[PDB]
Amino acid sequence: TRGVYYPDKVFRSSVLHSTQDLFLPFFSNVTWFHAIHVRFDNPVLPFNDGVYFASTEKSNIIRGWIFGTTLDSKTQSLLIVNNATNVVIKVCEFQFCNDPFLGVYYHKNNKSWMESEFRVYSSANNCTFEYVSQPFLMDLEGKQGNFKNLREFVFKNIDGYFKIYSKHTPINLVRDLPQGFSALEPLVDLPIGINITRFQTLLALHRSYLTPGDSSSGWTAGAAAYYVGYLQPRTFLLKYNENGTITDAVDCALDPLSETKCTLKSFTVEKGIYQTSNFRVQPTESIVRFPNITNLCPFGEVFNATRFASVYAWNRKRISNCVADYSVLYNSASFSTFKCYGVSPTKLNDLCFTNVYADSFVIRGDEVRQIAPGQTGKIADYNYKLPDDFTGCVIAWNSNNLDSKVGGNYNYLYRLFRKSNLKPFERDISTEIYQAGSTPCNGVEGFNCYFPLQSYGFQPTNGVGYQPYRVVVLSFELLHAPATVCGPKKSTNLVKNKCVNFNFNGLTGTGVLTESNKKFLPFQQFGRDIADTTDAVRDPQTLEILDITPCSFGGVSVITPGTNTSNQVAVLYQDVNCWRVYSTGSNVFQTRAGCLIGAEHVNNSYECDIPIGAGICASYQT
């Protein structure tokens, strides 16, 4: 119930939101550090995914922390030090001492504390970021009483951005970390942009006339303590009050009773049966994989062709074995017509298609509006019909400098008469004379016998409706086949036997990647089980079939006798014959419906209050 902060800056009121960020696990076994004069412990703790610095203070002991990789003037390291004058934040290659400390001296003649030793780093060569705060006066006076001030800090390192969250709460506890709930808020964002894998705590050193000896032994340690916690990425539920401050939080991975609140999206759980999940581990990494074909697609040839095909005999090109970069197409002002249905712009870069079909032809403005999937006319019904479930779309622009010359441009023809409706994705080249009446039309251009092909008059002086437009139609097909054309997204590495979110060839999901011995036929890429769930991935980068294991596979029934009534709960596992369970515990009872733990079984027979299954009933008694 500690370390909960605001993951985003979006203001929320009376709405519960589920966030997946790096948060403090509930009731975590954090390490305790003690420093009593009567134990100057300043170790180096690794920086895996975040350090939660919880410290209580009464005499201004903890000053700052050092962040870096090697801490030996070989890699970039960050300084945060708060001396008696200002706040210093620097990012340089500091040569750190073995035991850095800050020395504060005391005089017997006059009651005053003044800092005189600054032993943190040897020298700094190259510096990138430096921050100096406003000057202030700091007491630095020891107190003979108990602890008064509690300071909590959150450190996060994502994409090179350092965000610090802190909140001051006055406490009066002696040694134990105080309970309760607190909300932390951001104060500054530091774009350090360095890699940090370890950190060391820097404390304060006090000297006076009561500590004889040299510099290495004539000193005392102030009474202070601090704790270090890790921020494992887990899903949490946060309650945002009307004032904008979080007053409580719910963990979705602490206990089976806590997971019921996450599923129900409420802070109170009523009596009943709830199925959250099996033994569940929150994902820690995200991986995306795409084919390593570093070849540019031939989009330019289709859109910059010297000669465009006719309306009836429209060219068709197949695009494959390359990465499709649509950012040159959908981000240009030349394309007069760029309407798409189901393509989902700003997402093409993510999804994968079996193949790309490109059709090139020139038509007028009044007929380029007819390339909608549902339309009728002299073009959409006799020349080129698009299906209702057409995947892909049509790109058109204006062309009067090209394909339009003075004296007429009669090099383009279109179908005018036909005996039947054209099928979708069908091109017909028939020069046979159309017949209207019952008279024979065996190759005669007489009455009631007109040529199906009609010439196009592309005069430069025509109206904007009669202008000749260069039209390119992009067709995408989804088939049960390995994808050979996809987006330009990067492909990361591969991990095994871990609950990791995966993004394979445009398919996203959560699961565990494991080796599989199944043999896959070459033209099939995905496999599904009886439950119609994804179970195998071809992984074209390595061409190895990987089994998909769900992170939670078993059935779990949580017997919660309310929230305000009681807190103890009973967990029932349907597919367990009493182990892959949350906890063994005690009072394990095996029923016909499964294995029940956390509940006491009696030989009596009372009324059924909370049904379990197969004649098993449970109730809350003394």
């Epitope: 005999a313 068709r316 090109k317 090099n411 994705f425 091109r427 080249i429 028939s430 004379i433």
Partner: antibody, heavy 123, light 111 residues
């Protein structure tokens, strides 16, 4: 029907040639007329085509500024004119009648072919 | 243009001979049908197979063809003494904006 061309001709390296494809026993009304050349020892090449109803000629991208092909609907004849003859252009030319159809592929095919016309150059 | 075929093939009177015509993704891989032509040594070429499944009038039923993927296949059952001819595959090319012809296969059966 039948397609008849002219006899063998001999030209100069850099002269003009003119041959015709006369239809006998019928007319190729509402049927596209194309021309296919074949070098000795090489494969066929597509280099032109006429829809005689509208009199519009479409040429290939291999050469377009040196060959002008024309046809007459009244006499049902197709006339081939070529300029800037070279030594490599020594080949035989056939008048091909296109026969289109409706389908997913819809590729033009030549069912009827001419008897050929030898066009040779000699300095 | 790019309609490469084997330069020559060999066969027997009683054995089947398969001729493969492979192009690219702009002419053959785009779904366009392929037409086959037979050219006797001294006779103008004539249509043999159109639409990858149909046969015109006057052609023997021994000649068979099929198109799948980005390649074309032609199957001949009988190989008589008159079967020595040049075979070409022709389709529509989108990049060239015109018909494209094959390189031709030389079929010679003599002894």
């Amino acid at each position: 029907v039948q397609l008849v061309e002219s006899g063998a001709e001999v030209k100069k390296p850099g002269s003009s040639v003119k041959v015709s494809c006369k239809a006998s026993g019928g007319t190729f009304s509402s049927y596209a007329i194309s021309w296919v050349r074949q070098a000795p020892g090489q494969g066929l090449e597509w280099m032109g085509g006429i829809i005689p109803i509208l009199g519009i000629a479409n040429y290939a991208q291999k050469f377009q500024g040196r060959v002008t092909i024309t046809a007459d609907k009244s006499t049902s004849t197709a006339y081939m004119e070529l300029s800037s003859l070279r030594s490599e252009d020594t080949a035989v030319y056939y008048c091909a009648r296109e026969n289109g159809y409706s389908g997913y592929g819809a590729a033009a095919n030549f069912d009827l072919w001419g008897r050929g016309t030898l066009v040779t150059v000699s300095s | 243009s790019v309609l490469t075929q084997p330069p020559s093939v060999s066969g027997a009177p009683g054995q089947r001979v398969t001729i493969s015509c492979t192009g690219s993704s702009s002419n053959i891989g785009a779904g366009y049908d392929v037409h086959w032509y037979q050219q006797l040594p001294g006779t103008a070429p004539k249509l043999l197979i159109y639409g990858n499944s149909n046969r015109p009038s006057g052609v023997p039923d021994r000649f068979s063809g099929s198109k799948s993927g980005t390649s074309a296949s032609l199957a001949i059952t009988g190989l008589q003494a008159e079967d020595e001819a040049d075979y070409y595959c022709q389709s529509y090319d989108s990049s060239l904006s015109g018909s494209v012809f094959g390189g031709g296969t030389k079929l010679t059966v003599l002894g």
